[PDB]
Amino acid sequence: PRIITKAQGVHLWDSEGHKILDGMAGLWCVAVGYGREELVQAAEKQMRELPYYNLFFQTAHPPALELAKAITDVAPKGMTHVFFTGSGSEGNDTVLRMVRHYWALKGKPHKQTIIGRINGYHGSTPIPGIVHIPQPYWFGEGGDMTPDEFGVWAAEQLEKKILEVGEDNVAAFIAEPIQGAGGVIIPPETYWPKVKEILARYDILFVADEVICGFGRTGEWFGSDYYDLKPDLMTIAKGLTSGYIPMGGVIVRDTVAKVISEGGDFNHGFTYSGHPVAAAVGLENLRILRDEKIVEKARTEAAPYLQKRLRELQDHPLVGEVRGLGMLGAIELVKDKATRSRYEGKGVGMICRTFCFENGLIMRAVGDTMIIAPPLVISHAEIDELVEKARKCLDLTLEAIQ
Amino acid sequence: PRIITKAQGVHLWDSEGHKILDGMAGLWCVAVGYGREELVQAAEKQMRELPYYNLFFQTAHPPALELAKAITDVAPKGMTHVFFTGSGSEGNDTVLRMVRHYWALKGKPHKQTIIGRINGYPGIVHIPQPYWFGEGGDMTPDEFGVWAAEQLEKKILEVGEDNVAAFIAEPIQGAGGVIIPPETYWPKVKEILARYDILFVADEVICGFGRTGEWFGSDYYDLKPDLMTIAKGLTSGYIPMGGVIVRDTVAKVISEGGDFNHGFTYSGHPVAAAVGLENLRILRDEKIVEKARTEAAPYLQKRLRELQDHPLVGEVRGLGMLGAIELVKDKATRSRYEGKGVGMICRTFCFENGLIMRAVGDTMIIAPPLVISHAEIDELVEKARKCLDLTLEAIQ
């Protein structure tokens, strides 16, 4: 039984004193790495000054506002409003309400169906008003097409579905820039360009799920920045606080915010914001990401090296592919690299995960896809640690297959 | 907006150094009062040791478990499962999923309609609230209660048992002005629920963790709920967290029998749990809940009721650490100062005189920290009177 005693930077240590590199940044979230005392201190300060309560009585510099202001500053242009939640998934629920409630107020209440992709639908409990298009997963679902052309097809499928459902019954299309959860499904070059093209010609809202891509994970602040999308709403969480304290929220384009306020501010609960203690943490977490240039350094210094290094693993017999951008990476485990076939039923990723655990690496396995989203602050040294331990474990996995 | 610099016990101080008594315990939540360093220290400790989960490994004593264990210990008997959320309202959403998903797995997917009450929450239907003071006209409290309870049975039949998933109610409606039910209500509702195959959800977001004097409102009115939404006083509002407590029989049906929506991550944020656990440790181990029941509550209630003499007060009501004051133009008919917005004025004068009572229309309400002292109750009822006198004066 293996118990963690201490955590620092990108590393955990067990009771035995064995060092572990957390390649998944806690669970997608721990951006600035473990043990940043500044965040602890933010929380502490607020918790004793005034833990809860806003409006009528409030602190000298309410963290709710200053955090929102901070978020809108790093957001895509046009995104001026932030409605905070206690979690990321609460964010996605909230956005579903907001898009439907939005269209109602425009006097088009028929607009209700949400178009998701396969393997990124979310909760929402087939519901006679959430439909799916195929995911842009070339490696698994693109057979023998070129990435580029597969992308275009998977993008066109959106247009088809909008028409099939009918524009006047569609409320919104909603997608993670990169699905990352379903195994870092990085789209072909051509996808988002084409989806942009489509969205431009239909009167539907566009929700970027930045729960995972948010706050530096792509190298840019948001995946929406990276793929250059113009979303109407953005769900955030996780890296908002580097996972040091629960918080989520929705960033909202001005034009949309104005509609859920004017007309009817009943459901616009004059942004009671979120919890002061969470916000205080979030604000310091954002201050740190911008002011110590961690996002910038991820883009310019960590990312390029991580990607290069990770790709060296392509030589390994077991690896059908390495893919990744920013601080996202994935490794496909195949029986034959040519046909991209898997070790059917053997559950190989499981084995590879096992060996990662045993050898002081945290990669997550999504089926036969190993994935990584390490803290944005990982060093060259630590990337060397990572790709090294990765290889050890790939060798062990292969060995174990015989 | 007045600028608070520090908070202690049941008191805030502004920049001017003026002392303010928070009669609403933050917003229903701050149970143990402000500035308990123990809670700050719990959060701090966890935030640096291990702020969030990872796929593989965990700390020596994960606070998620220890908190759930702690909750199940204070819960009504049978309540063995806790699914945590990031908020209270996320709890109520979650429970809506759970009750519907529950019935589906029993092979009765038509069971979906939720029966709420008016002023607390086809899809979702409502019955009338047990608010004798406003909506009972000239009936006796007892008989009005029975009627308001019978209205449930009527609605179940109207909707039809095979389409009803659940009935869902706060034991006492906090939000909507401390709507304390007649004696007879909950007894009768129990009677009704006993004869229909529907689930019963207690919304303990507000009544939870001592507010009634017992741990839960469900304890107090002696209800046998199938699910309980919690939040707020779980951490004394020091850090956001919520959850659902779930009867064994229900939990067994949503886990095995229909392996689906209990993996995932409902395990709850370690940092929040650490706080929650210490908050609960404090409530049980320093006997705050017990002392609320036995020492604080009786005195608060007594004292508060002295205000009944005031011209403006149609009624004082309250149990445990809940209280309400009705502001009327004529005590006989229970009429209000229609349209004058009197509660507004009374609230205003409370703010200006270092008291936080919340106004729900013309109902002033209080839910002070469970730790309020006799001294502080004296402070409260005293400032209350001052402000009632000021409000009345201002009406001329």
Author numbering:
A (entry chain B): 34 to 158, 176 to 452
B (entry chain A): 34 to 154, 179 to 453
Quoted passage from the original study:
Omega transaminases (ω-TAs) can mediate the chiral amination of several unnatural substrates without the requirement of an α-COOH group and are highly relevant in the production of several pharmaceutical intermediates of commercial interest. There are two highly flexible loops present in the structures of TA_2799 and TA_5182 that mediate the entry and exit of the cofactor and the substrate/byproduct into the active site of the enzyme, leading to significant conformational changes in the enzyme structure.
The open state of TA_5182 is not easily observed. Comparing the open state of TA_5182 with the deposited structures in PDB resulted in an average RMSD of 2.0 Å, which is expected as the conformation of this state is significantly different than the PLP-bound state of the enzyme. The major conformational differences can be found in the roof loop and the outer loop in the open state of TA_5182. In the apo-open state, the F321 in TA_5182 is initially positioned near the surface of the enzyme, widening the substrate entry channel of the enzyme.
